[PDB]
Specification:
The structure is a homodimer.
Chain A lengths: L4 E2 L1 E3 L2 E3 L6 E4 L6 E5 L6 H18 L2 H17 L1 H12 L3 H23 L6 E9 L6 E9 L4 E5 L6 H12 L4 E5 L4 H14 L7 E3 L16 E5 L2 H8 L2 H4 L4 E5 L4 E5 L8 H15 L9 E7 L3 H12 L20 H15 L3 E5 L19 E4 L18 E7 L10 H8 L4 E7 L3 H11 L3 E7 L18 E2 L10 E2 L9 E9 H9 L1 E2 L1
Parallel strand pairs in A: 1-5, 6-23, 8-9, 8-11, 9-10, 11-12, 13-14, 13-18, 14-17, 16-17, 18-19
Antiparallel strand pairs in A: 2-3, 4-5, 6-7, 7-22, 15-16, 20-21
Pfam family, one (chain A): Aldedh
EC number (chain A): 1.2.1.-
GO molecular function (chain A): nucleotide binding; oxidoreductase activity, acting on the aldehyde or oxo group of donors, NAD or NADP as acceptor
């Protein structure tokens, strides 16, 4: 008698992998929860049934018909949230509020796209921009269109967001008429598989539209062909092995990468310790370090503050981090639970030791006993705050991501000649080699507009926090589905979400050049 | 004693490669024209100078200032057209009309982007779409923007369009504030290098803004970094080697590929021999086979016609092809010149032999004496027309690209029941090409063309519909209009360029700015939508 072996959904059937499988475990208590395996699956059939049946059946439906099916999946996921929260507590060791970022974040984003999708109407292709004359008499004209790619969407998803990573990607893919095969990271795969099971069991989507494989990834990319698309989230080192696969180098399948990102937070010159913007910065830093134990891809890793503001910053961060209780998320006194696994705990400990070689530890509450948890079993890590006094000559600050409740503060030299006062901090943020997000904090709303444009070429999102929006700003690390998610360089060169922008990744663009009456008839069969 | 060694323009200086260089030759007369070499250049310095010095200088200008420079380049190149035509005749062996496709096509495209860019105004970044609320009280909002990438643009460009390949890419890159390094194909590099030399001599752009290397490619991709962009045009096998380079696999630099493309022309069921659409189809196929001797990436390689039309179609094609005179483009009686080189002459001839294993050669004017040219020296290939009677079972038809005045005609089975379009089978057959830059379609019925077009759109980057109402205005199967997307999925590479403003995205970095509505206000005043 062993724990449940979770089956895969492939070629319209629930199939168990062979062998003993891989055990998922509770990262707080060490209890064995469920097992996964992909051993022995027929991956040629899995990919063909999705691509041929799943794709033809989705393409038969209009956008608005697909959107209505996403609305029904929203209602189903909401009705089962109690089950999802139980699995999150056990498999991920997250506080209820932190579980919500993944569960309800996923559902909210799915709902956003169901609503947006309803507006795309009862058509099978979309218009890109308007018609343009190609002739003096306007008898011959051109109109670009977007048509769903005749392939499958493979999602290789990270362990931190088993729900959101599924729905953030699946919602625009299914809206686009493209069938989904999700491969969630093993350690936290249970929620992804239960949600897929719930949806598949309800029969909302056609057969073949949504498939799941949990276990080994071996042989998956071998099945990818030129009209397929892949979206990978995970380590930069893995990313580079993936990109060398023949699916991409020889077959040219489209790829999106999200990888390591040393996201920055920049305290502006004007945000001194007497001003309201100073506290907003302290709070935002501590929230990003601690939500999910710092396991968001978008968490603040590097915090750049004026030389003069360095000691007051460290003191204020020390005091706010001290209120952070760590342990078992079942106890309501706990503010921050565990990392996802004891294996991740070891990578985080190892990252911490590596940073320590070039930074001073300003804060670490590792001697505080855990609440309702044994430190020798649980994958709990206490917040750790590093200070790097010389970031220009810094070796590791800008290059080593520690995927845990860890961040480094560094001073920058204020520019008070005339450019931006924050010019040095922009330069230091850029040394992270391209990131998902930077946030900037100031009392002056107008100044944040100027500064933002200086970070925009190296960050997929610039998030500006100031007293006028203390009540409304949506958070450094919280990804709003109407806004772009991705970043250049190190962060992977990828783009997803950004509302309608997400649909392009799933379609083929074409310029149609024709008699005006032909363009008129095309336009009658399309929408934007 | 030796022909001119063309210098490279790198790190703001004219530098000769070392060594004897590679000789470029006239593909009609065999005359040695000029030499190139990249041997010994300091590539790190060439790329670093363009990236910092060139990039900083271009980003300092506004979109409208950059566009004004492009408009200055237009007038310069227009002044110099005489020199450009003499180079094209000698290096490429093309007729005046065909040389115009590369020279005046490039100038036209540059000029189009110059006009486009002047509308973008005195700003340094663009808005992507409108502002959008992130909060119930609208105090916090989001606006996406596009900002030039802090990189270089490297163009590894094909032998067929030394001018248009440079300008169609350079125009959106320089409008976007991105310095350009162009590496033109060796065999026909001369025109590219002369146009770059004229523009750099003229002092129109900042130093570092436009560089050129001609000769060996070795070591160029090694200099590419994560914020640079690369646009390659060439064979699929060369593209594959290129995609594997650390520049893309490790560093994630953006890559656009244009590769082999077996573009289709489809005659609709209603375009029978007694209707005006039929002659438009015959004319278009012949024009595509013969312009530049078939050496456009976009040329029709596969022509699909109803079973009933197969004989009248071969008969009409042979008729029209027989009028195509071949030889020295210096002679006003010649309608088609040569291929770019004797090496391409051999490759095309190998391709013809490969296709003949599975196809019947229906027309071949190989024995017709050349005009003012020696067949043992020149690279003149006559038109060849293949017929494949069973395209469903054919292999080579749908997979083998012969980059010369060659095409294959195949019948399809008209579908006679109204679940489907009559051209259903021809659509399936076009798709067997595994993704192409363009398909054209021919009918008397304009409405019908609009429906058919949507059926080809997910496998073709452009669908080009020709009918009697646009006999006088349609812009040509193969001719690339800069306002329309150029590229295609699958075998054709998965690339996208041109498409008017759409071309700018490849050179920019897109970002969501989320801020108080006042900040969104101030970045809005500094940007153009």
């Amino acid at each position: 008698h062993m724990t449940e072996l979770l089956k895969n959904h492939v070629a319209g059937q629930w199939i168990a992998g062979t062998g003993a499988g891989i055990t998922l475990t509770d990262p707080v208590t060490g209890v064995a929860l469920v097992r996964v395996s992909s051993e022995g699956l027929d991956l040629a059939r899995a990919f063909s049934f999705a691509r041929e049946d799943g794709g033809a059946a989705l393409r038969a439906l209009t956008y608005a018909q697909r959107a209505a099916r996403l609305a029904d999946i929203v209602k189903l996921l909401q009705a089962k949230r109690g089950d999802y929260y139980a699995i999150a507590t056990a498999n991920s060791g997250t506080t209820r509020n932190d579980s919500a970022v993944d569960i309800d974040g996923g559902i909210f984003t799915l709902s956003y796209y169901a609503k947006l999708g309803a507006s795309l109407g009862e058509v099978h292709a979309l218009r890109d921009g308007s018609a343009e004359s190609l002739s003096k008499d306007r008898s011959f004209s051109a109109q670009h269109v977007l048509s769903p790619t005749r392939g499958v969407a493979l999602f290789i998803n990270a362990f931190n967001f088993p729900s959101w990573g599924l729905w953030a990607k699946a919602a625009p893919a299914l809206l686009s008429g493209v069938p989904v095969i999700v491969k969630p990271a093993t350690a936290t795969a249970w929620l992804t598989q239960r949600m897929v099971a719930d949806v598949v069991d309800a029969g909302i989507l056609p057969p073949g539209a949504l498939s799941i494989i949990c276990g080994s990834s071996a042989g998956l990319l071998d099945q990818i062909r030129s009209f397929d698309v892949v979206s990978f989230t995970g380590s930069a080192d893995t990313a580079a092995t993936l990109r060398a696969h023949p699916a991409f180098v020889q077959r040219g399948a489209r790829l999106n990468v999200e990888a390591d990102s040393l996201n920055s937070a920049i305290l502006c010159a004007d945000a001194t310790p007497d001003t309201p913007a100073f506290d907003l910065f302290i709070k935002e830093v501590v929230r990003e370090m601690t939500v999910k134990s710092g396991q968001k891809c978008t968490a603040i890793r590097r915090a750049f503050v004026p030389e003069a503001a360095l000691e007051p910053v460290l003191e204020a961060l020390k005091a706010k981090l001290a209120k952070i209780t760590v342990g078992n998320p079942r106890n309501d006194a706990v503010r921050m639970g565990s990392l996802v696994s004891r294996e991740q705990y070891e990578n985080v400990l190892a990252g911490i030791a590596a940073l320590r070689e070039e930074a001073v530890l300003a804060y670490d509450s590792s001697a505080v006993p855990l609440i309702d948890a044994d430190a020798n079993i649980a994958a709990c890590v206490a917040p750790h705050l590093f200070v790097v006094n010389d970031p220009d000559n810094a070796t590791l600050l800008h290059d080593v991501e520690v995927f845990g409740p860890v961040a480094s503060v560094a001073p920058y030299r204020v520019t008070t000649d005339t450019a931006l006062p924050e010019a040095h901090a922009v330069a230091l943020a850029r040394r992270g080699q391209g990131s998902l997000v930077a946030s900037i904090y100031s009392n002056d709303d107008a100044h944040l507009g100027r500064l933002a444009l200086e970070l925009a070429d190296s960050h997929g999102r610039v998030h500006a926090i100031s007293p006028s929006v203390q009540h409304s700003q949506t958070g450094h690390g919280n990804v709003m589905p109407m806004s772009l998610h991705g970043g250049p360089g190190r962060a992977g060169g990828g783009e997803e979400l950004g509302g309608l922008r997400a649909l392009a990744f799933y379609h083929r663009r074409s310029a149609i050049q024709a008699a005006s009456a032909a363009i008129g008839t095309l336009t009658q069969a399309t929408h934007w």
